[PDB]
Amino acid sequence: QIPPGLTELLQGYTVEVLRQQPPDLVEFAVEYFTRLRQQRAFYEILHLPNLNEEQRNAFIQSLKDDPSQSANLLAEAKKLNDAQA
Amino acid sequence: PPGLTELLQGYTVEVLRQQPPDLVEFAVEYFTRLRQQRAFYEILHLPNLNEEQRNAFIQSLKDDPSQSANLLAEAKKLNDAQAP
């Protein structure tokens, strides 16, 4: 069945599309959802308790430099976190 | 906006069909694919590039998505400048 939370997400995209009147809805979609994805990625990396500050800033800067790698790179963060605890 | 409903509807349909683990990740994925489709379409509806010339820009878009507007300007500056 329909995933819980899809309606809120698509609603946010629609809201920003109406507020900003982008010339390309597809490009604005890629932009919007890439920004949203990196936002939650920063959220995960910044909330993992067992990482330290050099690791935290290293993953955040690493996400800045190479964004597409995010889900690949944040997976590393989880596997670097499960270590210490 | 013209085309919003078809866009959101296609995304939702594919979300049900594929059940991705992350809706945001799948959004980036799906809409990047759509953007490349639109770019291929744009290149493909230029009247005064010719056929073999037309394929070359598509190959440029096949490799990495990050320099599209240059190819739209170059094609737009090549065709409306090539013929009649």
UniProtKB/Swiss-Prot annotation, chain A:
Q: Where in the cell is it found?
A: Secreted, Cell wall
**Can you say where the Immunoglobulin-binding region B repeats lie in this chain?**
38-85
Domain of life per record: Bacteria
Applications in industry or biotech? Important immunodiagnostic reagent because of its ability to bind the Fab and Fc fragments of a wide range of mammalian immunoglobulins.
How does it associate, per the subunit comment?
Interacts with host TNFRSF1A; this interaction leads to the stimulation of both surface expression and shedding of TNFRSF1A.
Q: What is known of its domains?
A: Each of the immunoglobulin-binding region repeats can bind the Fc region of an immunoglobulin.
Q: Which family does it belong to?
A: Belongs to the immunoglobulin-binding protein SpA family.
Q: What is this protein's function per UniProt? A: Plays a role in the inhibition of the host innate and adaptive immune responses. Possesses five immunoglobulin-binding domains that capture both the fragment crystallizable region (Fc region) and the Fab region (part of Ig that identifies antigen) of immunoglobulins. In turn, Staphylococcus aureus is protected from phagocytic killing via inhibition of Ig Fc region. In addition, the host elicited B-cell response is prevented due to a decrease of antibody-secreting cell proliferation that enter the bone marrow, thereby decreasing long-term antibody production.
Q: What is the name of the protein in this document?
A: Immunoglobulin G-binding protein A
Organism whose genome encodes this protein: Staphylococcus aureus
Q: Which gene encodes it?
A: spa
